[PDB]
Design a protein around this ligand. Structure first.
Ligand SMILES: *CCC(=O)N1CC[C@H](Oc2cc3c(Nc4ccc(F)c(Cl)c4)ncnc3cc2OC)C1
Length: 324
C-alpha cells in the first residue's frame, strides 16, 4: 500500500554518554552536548542530547517519540538524523553535535565575516535537504533559520522535525488542527485552512532565505501575528534585503505567490542558487565581501576549539560513523 519504513531505532545505554553539558533550555526542556562512546569501539562521537523537563506529561513522551520516528527515518547530507534514543527517567534524543549551532544565531553573530559565497551555498544546501525531504514525502512545516544547524560554516543541515508529517501513497495536503504555529513562516493557505504541502514548505524556504540575506532580521518585526493573514491578503511581502540583487529577491518573491503550484520546486531552487553560487558577487552585493573568511576543518584550533585533548585521539564525527 505504501513502502515499509525499515529505519532502525537504536536504543542507547546511558552509560555510553559522557562529558554532558548544557547548550540551551526552553519550556520544552534541554539540549546538552556530550560524547557517545559505543562500548568497545575506540570511537568517541560528539553528540547533542534533547530531553524534556519530565517524563510525566503523556503528550511529552509522545511528541518526542514522534520526532524520533521522523528523525530516524531520514538520511541525507543536508538533514540531521537520529543516532538513537536513551530511555531514562526521560526520553532523550541523541544526534550528531552541530558545533556552530543554529544558523539564525550564526548569521547574527558573524555577519561581518559572511560573504556572498556562503549565503548562496547555504541556500543550495537547504534546498537540497528540502528536496530530499520531499522525495521522502515529508512536509517539514517548521523550516526557519533557527531550524537549520551548522556542522561547519561550509555545511548546514535541517533539523527540528517535531511538526513534520508524512503524506500517504496518494495524498497531497496535510490538514492540521491546533497548537502554536510559526505564523510568520507559513504560507497563506496554511494560515487560513491549515493546508500544508511541499509547496507550503517552499514559502517557508523563502522566508528562511530572507532571514539569511538580512543577517538574521526578524520578519514582519512588530507586526502582531494576528495581523499577518491580512497583510498577506493585501499583497504585502517581506522587503528586498539591501544585499540582494533583483535576481535573488525575485526567487524569494516567487516562493510567496498565492497559487501554491506557481511557486518554485525545491529542485528548481537548487539549480538557480547553484548557478548563482558560481559567480556570487554578481548576485549578492556585500561591502568588503572578497576579504572574508570563516573557520574550515583544515585549521589548527578547529578540533581543539571543540575538543578536550584527552579525547582527540579517537573522536569520530557521526558522518563518518556508519553501522550496517
Ligand atoms: C537558533 C537557536 C537554537 O536552535 N538553539 C539554541 C541552542 C541549541 O544549540 C544546539 C542544538 C543542537 C542540536 N539540537 C537538536 C535538535 C533536535 C534533536 F532531536 C536533537 Cl537530539 C538535537 N542538535 C545538534 N547540535 C546542536 C548544537 C547546538 O548548539 C551548539 C539550538
Amino acid at each position: 500500500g505504501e513502502a515499509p519504513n525499515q529505519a532502525l531505532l537504536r536504543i542507547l545505554k546511558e552509560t555510553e554518554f559522557k562529558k554532558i553539558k548544557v547548550l540551551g533550555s526552553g519550556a520544552f526542556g534541554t539540549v546538552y552536548k556530550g560524547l557517545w562512546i559505543p562500548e568497545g569501539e575506540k570511537v568517541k562521537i560528539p553528540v547533542a542530547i534533547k530531553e524534556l523537563r519530565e517524563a510525566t506529561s503523556p503528550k511529552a513522551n509522545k511528541e518526542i517519540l514522534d520526532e524520533a520516528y521522523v528523525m530516524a527515518s531520514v538520511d541525507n547530507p543536508h538533514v540531521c538524523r537520529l543516532l538513537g534514543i536513551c530511555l531514562t527517567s526521560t526520553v532523550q534524543l541523541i544526534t550528531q553535535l552541530m558545533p556552530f549551532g543554529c544558523l539564525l544565531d550564526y548569521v547574527r553573530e558573524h555577519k561581518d565575516n559572511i560573504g556572498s559565497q556562503y549565503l548562496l551555498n547555504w541556500c543550495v544546501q537547504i534546498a537540497k535537504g528540502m528536496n530530499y525531504l520531499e522525495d521522502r514525502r515529508l512536509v517539514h512545516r517548521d523550516l526557519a533559520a533557527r531550524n537549520v544547524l551548522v556542522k561547519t560554516p561550509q555545511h548546514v543541515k535541517i533539523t527540528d522535525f517535531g511538526l513534520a508529517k508524512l503524506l500517504g501513497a496518494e495524498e497531497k495536503e496535510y490538514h492540521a488542527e491546533g497548537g502554536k504555529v510559526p505564523i510568520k513562516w507559513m504560507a497563506l493557505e496554511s494560515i487560513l485552512h491549515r493546508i500544508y504541502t511541499h509547496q507550503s514548505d517552499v514559502w517557508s524556504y523563502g522566508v528562511t532565505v530572507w532571514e539569511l540575506m538580512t543577517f538574521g532580521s526578524k520578519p514582519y518585526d512588530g507586526i502582531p501575528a494576528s495581523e499577518i493573514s491580512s497583510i498577506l491578503e493585501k499583497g504585502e511581502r517581506l522587503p528586498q534585503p539591501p544585499i540582494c540583487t533583483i535576481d535573488v529577491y525575485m526567487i524569494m518573491v516567487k516562493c510567496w505567490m498565492i497559487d501554491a503550484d506557481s511557486r518554485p520546486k525545491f529542485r528548481e531552487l537548487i539549480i538557480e542558487f547553484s548557478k548563482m553560487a558560481r559567480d556570487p558577487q554578481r548576485y549578492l552585493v556585500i561591502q568588503g565581501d572578497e576579504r572574508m573568511h570563516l573557520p574550515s576543518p583544515t585549521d589548527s584550533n578547529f578540533y581543539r576549539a571543540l575538543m578536550d585533548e584527552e579525547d582527540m585521539d579517537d573522536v569520530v564525527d557521526a558522518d563518518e560513523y556508519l553501522i550496517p
